[PDB]
Design a protein around this ligand. Structure first.
Ligand SMILES: O=c1ccn([C@@H]2O[C@H](CO)[C@@H](O)[C@H]2O)c(=O)[nH]1
Ligand SMILES: O=c1ccn([C@@H]2O[C@H](CO)[C@@H](O)[C@H]2O)c(=O)[nH]1
Lengths: 290, 290
């Protein structure tokens, strides 16, 4: 039922300089692979079959990462690294396609989603903001649950995360009557950007994971330039409120913002430790520090 | 006076896959910046003025990193973010030049250095393998001490460090009568590549920093192949021994192989704990795991 995801990757990422001066922020090493691999894997495991990169002319390396590399593959055969060759050959399953479209100028998350209008078609679709990483624990990730909730209700889904009461002015927080249980959705009635401490309508932050109906593309074509003179996804979802129910899905797992330098380092530590091959020896490198 | 360093960066480096799949192994992010910045900083802080990259068709992103990026810089001006702008424009001082030459085919380290012949001319020169990072704690870095010593002695220098007896198996090892002290050089008879664990002439590994005379280039033209990697540098250094004193310089610093997954994870930890801004907040994140 939900088979397409739009990853908007066209932004230059001024927040993680100089690391992203000359390679995309999305290709920042996290333990042993680029950040984007963790987001694409997340999508794939939630049953996504078509990855739609809305990208920029400097971001070839993202596209090259999900494609074959002749010179790389033949030097791996020449060195008999057959296991590695099989790992870099099958980064993504056979049935998963990676499509690419250009965002002409950088005019907001809303405008980036709109650039995928022609590939989304009449299909309903997920959005995953790739600067955010999502870590699970049990089987079936937060995006899987949210998608099957969109399928159940036919209500737009907006992934949210409880944050401490003293911090809500850093986040977009949703207006909900009550807060749902982890793994569950509630009707929401708007999102407020960076509300002042003591005046926010919930502790539930917008994360950067959406499931939206195609209808939203028509709504983005009729939303005026908002905050930062940029055309805004939150403003098109406000408009969707006029005809459709919109729910906040509260995640069971934990996020990392590989857009800040400190959220990046947090992610390396948490992914490092959990690494199926390096985790133990990484923990050991930690201990030996002091 | 040693002004020129050769950085052989032409090899694909299949040991830090998949990080290095679609970006150069040299651009892999260490804390907040590509690994190669640490190596170019090492050279410049030790009086280098011409950085000679011996490079490959797939590594523009390295050249770009020490160049200016028009679209990114104006994006930063428009957004009035001038402290970031300063961190991406003054990456090396005005007086330091970064030069490119192509290694046509990957025929070994010696062939890389020989590709730099036309640029180095009649001048003496440093060689830096950027896969290895070298961290100081004195205020004079090991490359500086080793150049300072080439200048007096007029003896070629090979940076070396002591390894556990059971691992001499893994490393280039120098033939020395005796171990110099941390910070000094002894005469050396040559290098044994991966000596059998019992039968090595010392515990002192070749680290990947050299200071060599111009005439090594003629020598490199008249060395045959070695380990099916046409020209080998150590063969040329042996050929040098039949004319001049060659010395082994033992380092006071510490090393990290950013090609080995654990060596890279160790550089992230150590370099992060000592970052101006993030060190204290990073130290903080590490404690919050136990
Ligand atoms: O105009 C654009 C195009 C893309 N993105 C992407 O959306 C996320 C932040 O909103 C990041 O992944 C960024 O690269 C934007 O934000 N704005
Ligand atoms: O043919 C070769 C062999 C090695 N190297 C470089 O030498 C260093 C150590 O072998 C690495 O950074 C590798 O890229 C080259 O540039 N070309």
């Amino acid at each position: 039922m939900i088979k397409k995801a739009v990853l908007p990757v066209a932004g230059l990422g001024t927040r993680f300089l100089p690391a992203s001066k000359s390679i995309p922020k999305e290709m920042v090493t996290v333990v042993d692979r680029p950040a984007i691999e963790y987001v694409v894997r997340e999508a794939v495991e939630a049953g996504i079959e078509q990855i739609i990169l809305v990208t920029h002319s400097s971001k070839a390396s993202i596209e090259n990462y999900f494609d074959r590399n002749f010179e790389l593959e033949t030097t791996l055969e020449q060195k008999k690294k057959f296991d590695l060759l099989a790992e870099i050959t099958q980064i993504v399953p056979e049935h998963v396609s990676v499509i690419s479209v250009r965002q002409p100028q950088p005019l907001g998350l809303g405008h980036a989603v709109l650039c995928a209008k022609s590939v989304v078609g009449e299909d309903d679709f997920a959005v995953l903001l790739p600067d955010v990483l999502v870590k699970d624990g049990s089987g079936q990730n937060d995006l899987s649950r949210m998608i099957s909730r969109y399928n159940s209700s036919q209500a737009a889904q907006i992934m949210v995360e409880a944050v401490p009461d003293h911090l809500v002015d850093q986040y977009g927080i949703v207006d909900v009557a009550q807060s749902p249980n982890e793994g569950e959705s509630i009707a929401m009635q708007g999102i407020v950007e960076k509300p002042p401490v003591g005046a926010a309508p919930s502790n539930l932050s917008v994360v950067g994971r959406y499931v939206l109906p195609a209808k939203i593309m028509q709504l983005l074509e009729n939303t005026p330039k908002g905050a930062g003179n940029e055309i805004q996804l939150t403003d098109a979802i406000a408009m969707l409120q006029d005809t459709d129910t919109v729910e906040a899905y509260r995640m069971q797992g934990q996020t990392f913002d590989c857009g800040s330098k400190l959220g990046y380092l947090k992610a390396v530590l948490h992914y490092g430790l959990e690494h199926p091959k390096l985790g133990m020896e990484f923990k050991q490198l930690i201990l030996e520090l002091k």
